[PDB]
Amino acid sequence: FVNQHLSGSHLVEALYLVSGERGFFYTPKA
Numbered sequence: 575f576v577n578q579h580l581s582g583s584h585l586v587e588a589l590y591l592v593s594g595e596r597g598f599f600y601t602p603k604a
Contacts, residue, residue, distance in 0.1 A: 589597060 586603070
């Protein structure tokens, strides 16, 4: 087990279209 998590734009970009600027819970986005 070697966990490396810092930046991941492909996942956080994809949801923006169906959910929109309201569905954000894990990690803060200003």
